[PDB]
Amino acid sequence: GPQPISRLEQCGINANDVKKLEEAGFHTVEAVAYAPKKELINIKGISEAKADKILAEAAKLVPMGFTTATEFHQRRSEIIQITTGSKELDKLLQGGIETGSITEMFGEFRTGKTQICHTLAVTCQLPIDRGGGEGKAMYIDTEGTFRPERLLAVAERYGLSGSDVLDNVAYARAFNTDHQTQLLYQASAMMVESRYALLIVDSATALYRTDYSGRGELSARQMHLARFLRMLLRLADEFGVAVVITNQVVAQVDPKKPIGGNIIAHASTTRLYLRKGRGETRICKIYDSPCLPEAEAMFAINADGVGDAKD
Amino acid sequence: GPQPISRLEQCGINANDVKKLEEAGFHTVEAVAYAPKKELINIKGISEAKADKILAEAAKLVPMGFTTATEFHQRRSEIIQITTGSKELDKLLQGGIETGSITEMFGEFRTGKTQICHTLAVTCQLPIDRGGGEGKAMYIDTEGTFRPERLLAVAERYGLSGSDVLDNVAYARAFNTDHQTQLLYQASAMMVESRYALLIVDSATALYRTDYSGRGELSARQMHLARFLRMLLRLADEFGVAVVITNQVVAQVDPKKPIGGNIIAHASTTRLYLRKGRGETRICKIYDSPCLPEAEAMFAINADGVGDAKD
Amino acid sequence: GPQPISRLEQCGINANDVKKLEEAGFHTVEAVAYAPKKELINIKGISEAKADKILAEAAKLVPMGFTTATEFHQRRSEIIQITTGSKELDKLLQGGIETGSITEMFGEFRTGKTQICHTLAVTCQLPIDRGGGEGKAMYIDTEGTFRPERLLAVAERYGLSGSDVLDNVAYARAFNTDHQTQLLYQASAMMVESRYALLIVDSATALYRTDYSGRGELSARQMHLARFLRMLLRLADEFGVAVVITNQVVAQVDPKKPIGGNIIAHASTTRLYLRKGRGETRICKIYDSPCLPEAEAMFAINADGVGDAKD
Numbered sequence: 001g002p003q004p005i006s007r008l009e010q011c012g013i014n015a016n017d018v019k020k021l022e023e024a025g026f027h028t029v030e031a032v033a034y035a036p037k038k039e040l041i042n043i044k045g046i047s048e049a050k051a052d053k054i055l056a057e058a059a060k061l062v063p064m065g066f067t068t069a070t071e072f073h074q075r076r077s078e079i080i081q082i083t084t085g086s087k088e089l090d091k092l093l094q095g096g097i098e099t100g101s102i103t104e105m106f107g108e109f110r111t112g113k114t115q116i117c118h119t120l121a122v123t124c125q126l127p128i129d130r131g132g133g134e135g136k137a138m139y140i141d142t143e144g145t146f147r148p149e150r151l152l153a154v155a156e157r158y159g160l161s162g163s164d165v166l167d168n169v170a171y172a173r174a175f176n177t178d179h180q181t182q183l184l185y186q187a188s189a190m191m192v193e194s195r196y197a198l199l200i201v202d203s204a205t206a207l208y209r210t211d212y213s214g215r216g217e218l219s220a221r222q223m224h225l226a227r228f229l230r231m232l233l234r235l236a237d238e239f240g241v242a243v244v245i246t247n248q249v250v251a252q253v254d255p256k257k258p259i260g261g262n263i264i265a266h267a268s269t270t271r272l273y274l275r276k277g278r279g280e281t282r283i284c285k286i287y288d289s290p291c292l293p294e295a296e297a298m299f300a301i302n303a304d305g306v307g308d309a310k311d
Numbered sequence: 312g313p314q315p316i317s318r319l320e321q322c323g324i325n326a327n328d329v330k331k332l333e334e335a336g337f338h339t340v341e342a343v344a345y346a347p348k349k350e351l352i353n354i355k356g357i358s359e360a361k362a363d364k365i366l367a368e369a370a371k372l373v374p375m376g377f378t379t380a381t382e383f384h385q386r387r388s389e390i391i392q393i394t395t396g397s398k399e400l401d402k403l404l405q406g407g408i409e410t411g412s413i414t415e416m417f418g419e420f421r422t423g424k425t426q427i428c429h430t431l432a433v434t435c436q437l438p439i440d441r442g443g444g445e446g447k448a449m450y451i452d453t454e455g456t457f458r459p460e461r462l463l464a465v466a467e468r469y470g471l472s473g474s475d476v477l478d479n480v481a482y483a484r485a486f487n488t489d490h491q492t493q494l495l496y497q498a499s500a501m502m503v504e505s506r507y508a509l510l511i512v513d514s515a516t517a518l519y520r521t522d523y524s525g526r527g528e529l530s531a532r533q534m535h536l537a538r539f540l541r542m543l544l545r546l547a548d549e550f551g552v553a554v555v556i557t558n559q560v561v562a563q564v565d566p567k568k569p570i571g572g573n574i575i576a577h578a579s580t581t582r583l584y585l586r587k588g589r590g591e592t593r594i595c596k597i598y599d600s601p602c603l604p605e606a607e608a609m610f611a612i613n614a615d616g617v618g619d620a621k622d
Numbered sequence: 623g624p625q626p627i628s629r630l631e632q633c634g635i636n637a638n639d640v641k642k643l644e645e646a647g648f649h650t651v652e653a654v655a656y657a658p659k660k661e662l663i664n665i666k667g668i669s670e671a672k673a674d675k676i677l678a679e680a681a682k683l684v685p686m687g688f689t690t691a692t693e694f695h696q697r698r699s700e701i702i703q704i705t706t707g708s709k710e711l712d713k714l715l716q717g718g719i720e721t722g723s724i725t726e727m728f729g730e731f732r733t734g735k736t737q738i739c740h741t742l743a744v745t746c747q748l749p750i751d752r753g754g755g756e757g758k759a760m761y762i763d764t765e766g767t768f769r770p771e772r773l774l775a776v777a778e779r780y781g782l783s784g785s786d787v788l789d790n791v792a793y794a795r796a797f798n799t800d801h802q803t804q805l806l807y808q809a810s811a812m813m814v815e816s817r818y819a820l821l822i823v824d825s826a827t828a829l830y831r832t833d834y835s836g837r838g839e840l841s842a843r844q845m846h847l848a849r850f851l852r853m854l855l856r857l858a859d860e861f862g863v864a865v866v867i868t869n870q871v872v873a874q875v876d877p878k879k880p881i882g883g884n885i886i887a888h889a890s891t892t893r894l895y896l897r898k899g900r901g902e903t904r905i906c907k908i909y910d911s912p913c914l915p916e917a918e919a920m921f922a923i924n925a926d927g928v929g930d931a932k933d
């Protein structure tokens with residue numbers, strides 16, 4: 001899909017500057033093209049005189065001009081949608097998780113966000129005709145609640161061997177917000193090398209609540225989260241992959257709202273509201289979507305992952 | 312297990328800064344690595360210019376990069392699970408209390424949380440093949456309800472001598488929420504020196520109800536509790552120990568819910584619902600778990616600790 | 623036993639602040655040690671700059687660090703247990719009322735809770751070898767049901783002079799919940815000057831039922847009650863005295879439950895269920911205890927106080 005950054009070398013950009021790019025997090029030409037002047041100036045071995053040359057060079061390699069809605073529609077006819085493992089959810093999402101956008105799943109505890117992430121980590125590897133994303137998977141955990149047994153269970157549910165599914169998912173533990181961001185640079189790098197289909201951060205806001213604390217650090221928290229979210233969107237556009245984030249909630253006291261403020265609400269293309277049903281089943285609700293109508297679904301959690309309720 | 316903080320000394324970090332670290336609560340290299348920039352800047356004798364040097368130095372000592380799910384699965388095949396002393400509970404937890412996570416036991420009064428803590432304080436010392444954690448024990452009491460006679464009774468139940476079991480458990484009394492936190496720094500320190508297997512706080516929320524009172528102090532209460540819970544999780548990850556917390560309940564008036572709001576619900580990896588049975592027996596229910604299914608158990612309280620009902 | 627508050631004066635704290643503390647209800651170093659920052663800041667003539675100095679200074683006077691269970695067990699071996707005047711109850715209580723904890727006696731009317739208090743107010747003065755607390759006695763009445771004649775009757779039963787027993791008992795009448803609280807401050811002050819052994823509140827919940835009324839004030843009631851119960855606990859730990867409270871019951875309609883909700887149940891270290899037997903005899907039952915097994919007893923009310931039944 002994406003063209004490697006080394007494409008700049010032969011066309012008229014020499015070695016020192018390009019080799020200076022990657023350790024700033026740019027492993028693709030598109031990332032350089034999508035970046036403004038400011039993101040190029042900051043690193044040491046680059047001056048403005050050649051910064052504009054690099055940007056102008058990267059411009060002609062990737063179409064960044066105006067297009068008619070027709071071609072975009074034809075490009076959005078080929079966008080892959082990853083099944084969730086449940087028929088109800090798939091009909092609510094009209095196919096499942098759409099790649100190339102940021103999906104947010106929020107709710108109280110036990111609402112099932114972790115299991116959806118686990119099932120997505122496996123369903124992303126299915127063939128396209130099976131509703132799968134047909135690619136690798138990346139899981140970033142900020143809570144230590146990654147339990148591969150669920151991956152094994154769902155893998156066997158579709159008849160996939162348990163060995164390959166485990167070897168074919170990327171994992172990392174975020175201990176603070178800063179470490180939670182350096183992983184995104186590895187996200188860029190590794191996706192250049194291998195075909196990924198899904199990016200998961202669980203949770204994208206768990207460590208932000210405590211690291212940034214009080215009305216004082218709120219502004220800095222929002223800025224850090226916004227940069228986090230802009231990085232993610234860049235990853236989604238530069239590799240065309242599904243970004244699924246999990247968010248926590250806070251009770252409204254004056255009946256619950258997701259945390260993160262308006263920043264995560266705007267950044268998130270699609271938000272899903274999760275609430276408990278009866279027993280193992282739970283309720284999913286579309287919180288935000290540009291074209292999808294506001295509706296509901298009835299999804300269950302079984303010993304073999306998210307699926308359909310018996311009734 | 313964990314590497315001592317003094318590992319930084321020989322590799323290129325001098326004495327003054329390291330000796331400035333420990334009194335901030337950092338007695339392990341991992342704690343420094345897991346901490347963000349902000350936690351390093353706050354203390355006096357450290358500047359950013361060397362703060363990044365310390366963090367970069369600690370980075371190469373502990374793997375904080377991406378990993379495949381296979382190796383994590385192999386690491387989670389060796390995780391110790393501490394038996395509770397009851398067969399039913401062990402089958403519900405598929406072995407018992409999992410180390411390296413935060414376990415929450417909540418319920419009304421007399422539900423048995425104290426006796427489970429007491430039995431865990433002894434079962435954590437058993438050999439691994441006996442289902443025990445094979446380590447020391449730490450018990451933090453916020454209610455003054457620590458009665459060693461129960462420790463003696465359960466100790467003799469397994470045939471362990473009553474002398475060593477008492478000498479091999481750490482005790483402290485928390486009188487306010489602030490004192491309840493300074494103990495966690497001692498928790499870090501002492502676990503560096505001796506092999507611990509279990510951390511108990513009883514109760515993690517008892518003193519928060521009264522110290523912080525009203526709709527006014529609620530926000531501050533939640534912030535203080537969240538910091539409490541992040542410290543604990545850091546201890547759990549930095550020593551790989553079981554964190555068992557006990558929580559209270561409030562009747563829902565509009566049939567009971569644990570106190571602490573969504574913060575303790577999200578932070579707690581696993582929550583157990585306790586309710587009275589008939590006579591001495593009581594009922595345990597899984598309230599939250601990433602991979603464990605929602606099921607129930609029938610656990611009894613005897614004169615020799617938590618065990619199996621006669622019927 | 624407890625150290626006087628004036629101990630801070632010579633150790634580096636000046637007079638003005640110290641004299642400001644006593645009118646806030648702090649008459650011992652331990653109380654200052656156990657209080658958090660917030661309780662110090664609220665008073666006018668105290669600033670955070672010196673508050674921390676005060677807390678740190680008091681910290682070195684009272685051991686507030688970790689300890690081994692062995693020492694604590696040895697400290698609990700010397701804990702005084704006050705006999706109840708009945709062999710059955712004492713065997714149920716394995717010696718009698720344990721000092722340093724909060725014990726709750728609940729039941730319907732005429733269950734004898736007031737009579738138990740009257741007997742305790744006397745037996746607390748007995749020599750230790752006789753099972754008595756060897757200390758003074760403090761009686762808080764919220765109902766005006768305090769009858770010294772019962773004290774005289776019990777006094778002569780043990781052969782003590784009726785004059786001294788009446789002169790050695792502190793009495794107070796609480797007319798509303800707020801008044802019910804201010805007495806605790808006087809309780810704190812008085813117990814510093816003289817050795818007390820027992821604190822009795824009868825009833826700890828009588829005035830709360832009527833002063834706060836309806837679902838609206840309910841939340842406020844529990845808040846007010848929760849604080850009340852923490853002052854009590856603090857008195858118990860700072861003086862090592864027995865705290866006995868009497869609670870009413872409400873019929874469960876959907877066969878009775880003690881009033882106060884989960885708040886009083888959790889705080890209550892030991893709860894006793896009282897129910898009438900036949901004639902003058904009545905039945906006691908362990909409702910909650912950290913260490914005692916659940917069992918029953920047969921205690922009788924006689925013309926000379928609580929005792930054993932003739933049969």
Ligand SMILES: Nc1ncnc2c1ncn2[C@@H]1O[C@H](COP(=O)(O)OP(=O)(O)OP(=O)(O)O)[C@@H](O)[C@H]1O
Pocket residue numbers: 108109110111112113114115143145280301302303304576577578579597598599600601602603604605
């Ligand atoms: N193997 C399984 N079979 C059935 N149900 C399961 C299984 N594993 C987990 N569950 C259920 O899935 C639910 C979701 O738990 P989970 O840990 O994912 O919650 P969460 O929404 O991520 O919470 P938090 O914010 O606290 O992390 C729980 O109620 C649990 O009982």
Ligand SMILES: Nc1ncnc2c1ncn2[C@@H]1O[C@H](COP(=O)(O)OP(=O)(O)OP(=O)(O)O)[C@@H](O)[C@H]1O
Pocket residue numbers: 419420421422423424425426454456591612613614615887888889890908909910911912913914915916
């Ligand atoms: N030695 C023993 N033998 C049998 N049962 C016992 C023994 N010690 C305590 N129990 C019982 O254990 C039960 C649990 O009491 P416990 O004090 O642990 O309650 P809890 O849930 O911690 O309550 P709280 O929130 O009020 O502290 C009580 O009903 C008590 O009767």
Ligand SMILES: [Ca+2]
Pocket residue numbers: 113114143145202
């Ligand atoms: Ca989760």
Ligand SMILES: [Ca+2]
Pocket residue numbers: 424425454456513
């Ligand atoms: Ca308890």
Ligand SMILES: [Ca+2]
Pocket residue numbers: 109110575576577578579580581599
């Ligand atoms: Ca949880």
Ligand SMILES: [Ca+2]
Pocket residue numbers: 735736765767
């Ligand atoms: Ca009465």
Ligand SMILES: [Ca+2]
Pocket residue numbers: 420421886887888889890891892910
């Ligand atoms: Ca209790």
